[PDB]
Symmetry: C3
Subunit: 175 residues, 3 copies
Amino acid sequence: SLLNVPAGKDLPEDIYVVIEIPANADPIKYEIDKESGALFVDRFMSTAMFYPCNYGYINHTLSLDGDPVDVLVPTPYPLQPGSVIRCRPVGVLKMTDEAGEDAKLVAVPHSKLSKEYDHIKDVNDLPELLKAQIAHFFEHYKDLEKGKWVKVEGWENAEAAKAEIVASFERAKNK
Amino acid sequence: SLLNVPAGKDLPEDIYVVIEIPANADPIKYEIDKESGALFVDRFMSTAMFYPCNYGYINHTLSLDGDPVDVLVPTPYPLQPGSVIRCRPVGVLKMTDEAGEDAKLVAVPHSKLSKEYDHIKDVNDLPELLKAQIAHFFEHYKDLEKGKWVKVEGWENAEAAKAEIVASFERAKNK
Amino acid sequence: SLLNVPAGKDLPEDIYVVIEIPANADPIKYEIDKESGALFVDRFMSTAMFYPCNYGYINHTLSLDGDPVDVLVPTPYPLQPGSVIRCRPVGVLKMTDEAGEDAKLVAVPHSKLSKEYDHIKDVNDLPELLKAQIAHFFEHYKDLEKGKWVKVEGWENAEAAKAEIVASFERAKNK
């Protein structure tokens, strides 16, 4: 099942993201269940916005908000929810919500799947427009959910991203 | 897998429907397999009609036609086949086909996912139009399958719905 | 899971294909993983082409290129990737890439799902156009992947198809 999926083939320059929400899709927020491994409708988003990239998580990891690391992956065409893409971290958007700080990484499809993302080695290689779009999306998607807020601090490099991967792995089962 | 999915987290005002067919979709009738838990093309529908809501079943239940309880869930945007939505029964369309009797329940998305369905407490709260549409759909979808017929008897309340849930759960035992 | 799916319920006039890529879809090449049974993005196709039919494999089989037998299934409407269709082999397109000659079978939806494919008993029953389209697709889809080539030899009958099914079933498990 989707639970039996490797965090990566070779952490952390080579990961597997499990996709929950496709780029440019209807505003349904899906999630994979811990016990079923099934795609659950987590929520119907209230703002009229869409994810600017495919949105998912790395299996066998844990952020300190009590969830796996979240990754945004851009692709030429939207991916099936519940499907897996081998990619390569290239940055992180650092933001804080309530309150367990909520960093989101950005990984691009691995060279084996496509060479279109080879010239993107680090966060600055991403277009400014897409970056502003991601930032703006996370600044606002929850605006119509009372008692929910997000402050976006900023972008950090691929090493920053890789760091969070290794960290959250190991915070990964242990306790 | 999709077999390992709870009937509900608190029957019966709080259930899980496994979605097989999305609202307003192509006329492919999918089903989840008992052994694989895989989404199987059960049939290509012959009439030019679409399901007016997402269509699915409650896991760990059995109707007396030899299938789990079927639930129709309305949502703002169609759901991925094979995905799960936490909802709340609000009624039942009572109908009879060839092989005994074929009640179909109507559950609305749980308040945790959206508050859009909070004012729908019972069957009458659903719009007339949607009700007539469901009824009409089930009256006719099988018209071009010889030796298949459906007579729609009528609508019953949420407690009627809840009843069928509890019943069919327990009848829940025997494959 | 999708791993636990029968090759067929009565080989070889009655098979199960696991669908990876839908007809007329975005050019994402998906695959089912051997360990997870999960839908993995195998590759982003580089040519501006689409699969003319749904594309998938028979579970519990092995071709001599080190993969299950691949089947193309036509349907009236595209199928969900990762879903299973009971169908009935009616032909085979014989082609060579290498490493590993690359026959692709063509099965049509079983009569239980639809009678639309009843009159297609063998390869010649398929329309010319669809045949030329499949052939032309496999001749060219890999044109922009250096060091990859395909020569299409030709079409063979349903018996030829069923043969490859029986062969590749055995060729598997047994070491």
